[PDB]
Symmetry: C3
């Protein structure tokens, strides 16, 4: 995590070269995670059909520790959809995105697991309060 | 969801052309979902080995909101196995399937999330009761 | 399960031929499962970037019934990392591994589901206790 996987029958050659970089930047901001650990895995030219039909489609997954809830999921879904519509020429009704909560102690980075506090976004909340105190001095 | 992913070292050119369409129809019926949102993602010619050996194998996943339980999982597993044996020429002892429950509010389709009632199959249970009443002379 | 999935932008031609066999043997021992049902799915030459950058990286998953807990996950992560560094020439800070608990009744092998006692490692724990009692002279007549 965070890992954005895009499974699409749209041909690799036909996808803008900056698509993964743009999706990296967008989801870095949306998930409030360090850019350094944001993966984008583009499986383009996939043998994926939807509704028994080979028109352009996307099944995408977002794997993340914390950050995922009904409100953030819908907002991120619509922005991811918009990028797929614009850059892959895929219709909104051919896009399904799964949001996958990852437990902090069920995910390694760089020789260690993650802090459990991230699952409840306490990393953000505690930094948000500290920054508020710096700007208001209280 | 519903997304059926098939990971197999069986060569793409060896797979019947209608395999994905047939798996779509079968799992549409089995999962009682609209055909329109049924994905089949075939990863054929995959660099997948099983038991350290490159004999034909399948690792498949079924991602679905509701519908998955110990009873439906076993029945769907045996039918998916039968389709892999017949169409991919893979032995039953080289097939593993994972059934993945998806939360309604953790899955988008067409600009919206899904109804939480689907997670508990309330859509099926409520339609089953309504159809029972229609067929057995109960219209009020 | 157990399924080890390796997603790496490292080119297939650059990966030692025995990488999957070595990962199979290592994780068979680590997860205390039959070798027969250990899958290794290598997606090499993947179009996967990390931090907006195309330096060598690995996103791997371990799908397993039982066996996964904070203690086993860290130990397996470091050994998997060591094998990826050696075989894929990737830096530790370009490796993320997700450990995925699989329910026994949500996974088929060879026409049947899995017991359910396996989820809580009761197969290992009950065999460990029975072998301890064998070696320390306890009978069951
Ligand atoms: Cl998952």
């Amino acid at each position: 995590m965070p890992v954005i996987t895009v499974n699409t029958n749209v041909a690799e050659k036909s996808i803008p070269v900056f698509f993964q970089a743009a999706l990296t930047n967008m989801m870095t901001k949306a998930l409030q995670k360090p850019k350094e650990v944001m993966f984008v895995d583009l499986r383009s030219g996939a043998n994926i059909m939807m509704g028994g039909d080979r028109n352009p489609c996307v099944f995408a997954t977002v794997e993340c520790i914390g950050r995922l809830n009904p409100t953030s999921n819908l907002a991120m879904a619509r922005d991811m959809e918009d990028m797929f519509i614009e850059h892959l020429n895929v219709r909104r009704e051919r896009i399904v995105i799964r949001f996958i909560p990852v437990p902090a102690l069920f995910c390694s980075f760089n020789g260690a697991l993650h802090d459990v506090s991230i699952e409840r976004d306490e990393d953000i909340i505690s930094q948000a309060i500290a920054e508020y105190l710096a700007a208001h001095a209280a």
